[PDB]
Amino acid sequence: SELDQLRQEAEQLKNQIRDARKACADATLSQITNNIDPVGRIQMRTRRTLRGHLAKIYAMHWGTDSRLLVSASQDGKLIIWDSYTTNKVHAIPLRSSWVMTCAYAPSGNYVACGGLDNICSIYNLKTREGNVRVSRELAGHTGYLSCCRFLDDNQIVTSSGDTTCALWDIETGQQTTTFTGHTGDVMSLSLAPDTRLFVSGACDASAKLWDVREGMCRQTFTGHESDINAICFFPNGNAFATGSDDATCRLFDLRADQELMTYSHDNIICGITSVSFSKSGRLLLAGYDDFNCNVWDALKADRAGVLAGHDNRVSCLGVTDDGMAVATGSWDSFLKIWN
Amino acid sequence: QRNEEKAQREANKKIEKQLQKDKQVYRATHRLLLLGADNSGKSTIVKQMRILHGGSGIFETKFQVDKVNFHMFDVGGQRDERRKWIQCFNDVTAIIFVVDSSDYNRLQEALNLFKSIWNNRWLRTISVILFLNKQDLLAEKVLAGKSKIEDYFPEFARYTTPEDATPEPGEDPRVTRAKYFIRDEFLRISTASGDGRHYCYPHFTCAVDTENARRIFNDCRDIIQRMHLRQYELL
């Protein structure tokens, strides 16, 4: 037959790939960076505390001005905050209370959100009659929407539990591009700083780099033992970090096409929920299930500081674009700003 | 520029007072998640609740018993994996687990799903209301005597109907032993884990039953009572 011969040639390719991967592993990142000086103890403190949410927070995203931010709670709300003064700028009620993600358009004109309704809803904050209302609403997914991020005010990429990601044209409401190939539920995506590529971490313990304009998967990275829960890009664009349920963070490089470094401790046995780099990429912040956030030195794999301020699982995080502060959302219905 | 500070302050005030009314409404709605295998009846119970009492097959139903509001939701439009969207329901008041008690071979699937829900790290405190549905079909199969329980659960051969059993008037002891055996297989799991943070309340429903509401009301009340007890260590 032919299915078993394609399965065999598949395994042959997988071993040629493993050999081509061990071929470029001439050194390790730790040996190269062993002579650098450590970042030192990093003790950030809560500068603001943002209250108001009636349920567990699931997503947050700073704006480009690094001042406003949106947070999504399971009371059916999406609150926009002026993080400097802790005032609430908007409180958007949702037709479905099971929201799971939220993004902030780089123009500050739109917020997005979606969840178990399998629908991505875009809301125009700069409406002309007075009050924020629904502007677009994207249907087509057969699974729950786990993450979404704007490219511009008219293009938006979504990740869903039907094991697919999709690039949408908000006006026509059509999926202008579909990304398939993941086996498990896609949990997180992160767009490259130039909108040109984006990576995705799925529940099949794999991350995939996708070409936005062509709809093809360029590179697939593995190494995690369990579900990948969070992902982000290195500020340079040629590296990215992943966090998974096996209580480990891993730094992969795009051009070398294999894992570079692993961040773990034998006293942390909980599933990583969120990851994000600092402005310079020297610090990697990760949110754990044990209610804490660990700040790792992205070059030496040593753990440097902790942000112990939540009383329940930290569900999300994000660093400002100016690097001035990091926010952490948890299932206690509170957001906390750190710097 | 102080004017913009006052405009932000009064936008925050209108927001906070809308959020206060929303807090009272959300605080007074009792969310109930309906879970269970298919061919069991989740949708039929939501529909029959929407027929008699009222509400908004659709994921949700909203009904009131004695001035107490409930919102019951069954998720229909997902895949078959549930290890990640299940955590969207860690704060529900109770999970209504529906099990086709008359389907002798998909019963192991229901037991395994109940075990995975009961020992979930994020659902450790969510109590489950067990609906052993389709009792009329179970009586049909037991009286027919064509498919016997011993072929799927050999323990059933040595099982004795409990001395605390309350059969309805006119029930064959074989039917009592079959439905109380399914009852005890799920109670053996719920008490095998325990820890007193949550409990399982079995109820032998048929979906078209009029009282399903009352049973949920009575049990949500018991769950809150026991939560308040275990809070003051009185339990």
């Epitope: 086996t183 033992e225 | 075990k115 995975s116």
Partner: nanobody, 128 residues
Framework: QVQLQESGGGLVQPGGSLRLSCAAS????????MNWVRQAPGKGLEWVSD????????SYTGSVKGRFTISRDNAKNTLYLQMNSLKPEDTAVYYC?????????????????????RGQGTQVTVSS
């Protein structure tokens, strides 16, 4: 990359015997609860037996209770389902599934079509 390879299992007359060896590569074997999920021809996935993180607590589906055993060896990084007294209905593919999270007791791995942490299967056939 997590990958699970099962082996053993062929045409065996009723009342015979077999031993299915599932070798795991790509993770830490000790942390994960392991299961044996079988699929008979023409029916959905069925769950056969599970063994805990260290062989402490074992459990079986009713139909295979008292016939099969399941042993875990973390040293050689494998687990074995020793089947004896096979019936004409034990003919099925036998995937060796791993629960998707370490250090826990729950899993959801009998999924209808696609689960990412189970092997490929060894079609065990039993007929006269």
């Amino acid at each position: 990359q997590v990958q699970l390879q099962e082996s053993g299992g062929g045409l065996v007359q009723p009342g015979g015997s077999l031993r299915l060896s599932c070798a795991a590569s790509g993770f830490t074997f000790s942390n994960y609860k392991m299961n044996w999920v079988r699929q008979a021809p023409g029916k959905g996935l069925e769950w056969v037996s599970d063994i805990s993180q260290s062989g402490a607590s074992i459990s079986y589906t009713g139909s295979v209770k008292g016939r099969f055993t399941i042993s875990r060896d973390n040293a050689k990084n494998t687990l074995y389902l020793q089947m004896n007294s096979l019936k004409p209905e034990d003919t099925a593919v036998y995937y060796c599934a791993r629960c998707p999270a370490p250090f826990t007791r729950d899993c959801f791995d009998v999924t209808s079509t696609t689960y990412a942490y189970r092997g490929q299967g060894t079609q065990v056939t039993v007929s006269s």
